[PDB]
Design a protein around this ligand. Sequence first.
Ligand SMILES: [Mg+2]
Ligand SMILES: [Mg+2]
Lengths: 64, 116, 204, 144
Amino acid sequence: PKMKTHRGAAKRVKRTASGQLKRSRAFTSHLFANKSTKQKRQLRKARLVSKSDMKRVKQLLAYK
Amino acid sequence: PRVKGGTVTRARRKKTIKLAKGYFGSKHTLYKVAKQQVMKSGQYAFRDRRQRKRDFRKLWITRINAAARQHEMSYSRLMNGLKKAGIDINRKMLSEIAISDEKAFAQLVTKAKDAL
Amino acid sequence: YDVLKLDGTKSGSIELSDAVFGIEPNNSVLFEAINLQRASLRQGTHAVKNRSAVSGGGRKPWKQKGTGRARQGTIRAPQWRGGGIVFGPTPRSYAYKMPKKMRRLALRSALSFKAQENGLTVVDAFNFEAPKTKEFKNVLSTLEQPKKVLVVTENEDVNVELSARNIPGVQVTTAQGLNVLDITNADSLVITEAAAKKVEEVLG
Amino acid sequence: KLHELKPAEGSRKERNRVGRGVATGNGKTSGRGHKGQKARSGGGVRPGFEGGQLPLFRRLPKRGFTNINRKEYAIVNLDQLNKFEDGTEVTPALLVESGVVKNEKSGIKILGNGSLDKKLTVKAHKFSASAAEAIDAKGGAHEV
RNA sequence: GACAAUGGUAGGAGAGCGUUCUAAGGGCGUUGAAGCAUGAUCGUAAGGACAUGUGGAGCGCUUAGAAGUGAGAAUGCCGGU
RNA sequence: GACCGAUAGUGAACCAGUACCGUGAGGGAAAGGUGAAAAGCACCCCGGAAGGGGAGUGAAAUAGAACCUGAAACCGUGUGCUUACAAGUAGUCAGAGCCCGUUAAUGGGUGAUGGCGUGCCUUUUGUAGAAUGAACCGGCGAGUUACGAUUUGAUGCAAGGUUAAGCAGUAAAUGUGGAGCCGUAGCGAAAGCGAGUCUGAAUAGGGCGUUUAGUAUUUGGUCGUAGACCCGAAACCAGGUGA
RNA sequence: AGGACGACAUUAGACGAAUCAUCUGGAAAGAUGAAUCAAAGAAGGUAAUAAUCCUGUAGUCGAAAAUGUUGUCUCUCUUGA
Ligand SMILES: [Mg+2]
Ligand SMILES: [Mg+2]
């Protein structure tokens, strides 16, 4: 049998043009009165899945 | 293809038993008992090539010491002068001179007292 | 491509060679189109039991605790005298493919080793009415051919290949039925004129 | 010949058989270490499982959707059109057959990265803005 | 030919001996093969020969391929004492 | 048939689901080989007979139905050196005295006396351990294959590489088969725009890009789905047999 | 929805080419010598390892009979836009 893509991770992640992934920042759901305006604004830009956590998920994202 | 266990457990368990002939009782007949005596009789020999060189020196010094005391000199007064009076090269295996020719060993004792 | 022969002869000596009989042969491809052929002739019908295919052995043999001897689970286990084979042969299959630019380079490196070594001989189209091996052994003696030759003909005539089957060494293959294991098994190659224009029309 | 075959130099390799000695290294424990979960026959935990702590992908939010229809166009730059030499019209019955476009999805877009260096009758489903100018510089045409 | 390095368990890397089988080239064998037994031999190691005895018909060597490929222990399993 | 060759391959090469165990359903092993040809030992002798030793058949009975070759453990009979004042993980290195004579090389067997020396694995911060395991000898007994994934080594071409099922062909490894797939162009949640694009009133500033090498088969490593290195539970459920 | 006449296949079977003499041996198929057949050098046995000793193989050849597969000959049946 051929490998199945982790479907809970393809919904959360795109693939760029150097192999490195792309994610959205956490804490963007509720309780926006306990966060500053210098903090609610910088949980909006997007970042890249880190070098540590790319070592764990090499097999789960193979067809992206 | 099925590789049957052939004639390699004959030969490998002979060339250990044949090294171990001359041992007491069952240590020359059984495999497991004569195996692990061969591993120790090549380990005892490894520290007995290193020990042989330094326990024939605890004998040559004993003979020289029992040669200078009859000429009334210590050993430690004898391998002092022969480094300092002459440049008589350091040799203790050649305490064979003291056994063989006492007339030859006497002139060294003359040269040791001469410049000490 | 030396000249020609009939049985001690010459004719219009064809010379118009191509990149089929002249390329410097690589051996990295020629070694790896023999293993693709020598390891595809094996059928691989070979198998063995495992713990679930032997007959019996489901009752626990009454040895758990309170008997003084070892813990044992079935009487069909790889420790045990009877069946149960851990990692045995399975019925598998041995074949793989290779690029089509690398299967055409192989015949340009096995034909190309025959003209470097003068192991090629072109003859005219010989016609046997009835097949006789005694008629055919008078041919290869005066042609000075070695113990093992590969006879190339254009189309499989039903009188050429029926002779020369019991001559040990001699195999008779048509023009598009050439292999790589055959050509590096022969010692000198004998091609008809009507087929030397045919295997070259395929490749060059 | 066949009684003497050599492989390619540096192409082949032995294989490690574990557990079959003591001086080969991989022996009496086969290269796993001592006790634990992942030194058991079939142990080792599923990938992307941190151990009980919530994983990476249950700590990020989901984002996006599909757009079921989603047209896709095949890319031809202007640098890839110097392959056509002599005054040639550039037709989707020609731009596929040479080998420029292989197996297009929908109509051919003509982007501008290189230069044509030749006048050409160009027909394409969608031009861009910068490639419908370097065609007009040499003198060309359009059709949508 | 100088100057250098070389204890080592978990573990990473390299280089080799051997066993059954197949393909190709060469070869020994009833003027006696394999197997077994004795020996004071050869290589840095696994391992290779050769010399008499028993044995009574099949076996090695060079290059490459493929593995049911190597046993001192699992209160391991059957047989013998 | 790059499958096995009597602990193997069927449980079964022997008159096998048979001796034997169970009230019952049900469980279940052990066994092969004289010689080319029975020419399978006439007759004498010790014996109550077995079993022997001669004579005979045979290439050989030192192949006699305990019947091819005949390993080790273990029990014997013979003989060169040695031991009845000594505290021994049984060896090692130094060495007198004695009896021998090989694959000829600064040889072999034996060992009065002296020095050093608390077995082997497995688990441990640490085992002579009075912690675990094996009576001994012999066989058997554990990282394997498949279809995918990724990196490394090779090789063929290289802005291009390559076929899948199928049909012809010697269970041929080789010709057709371009459906398909990965690359040549990214960016955004998406419309879309495109060497640029998205966020933004604004290329103002920043995110990811751009000025290049890929692909197809295979050697090795490892990961995934499969019993996945092998051995061992207490127990759960489904049909059935028993007062 | 109810039959005949012979074509072919299956369950018996037949033909089927070509080596003689010495050495070692208990025995020739072996090595040393001369011969031959080959649409036949696949394989097994014969006092050891046989293309030519035997049973055979490539190839032809064969059915009193009982099934089986189909061709065309009946024979049943039919209105077409
Ligand atoms: Mg004790
Ligand atoms: Mg009652």
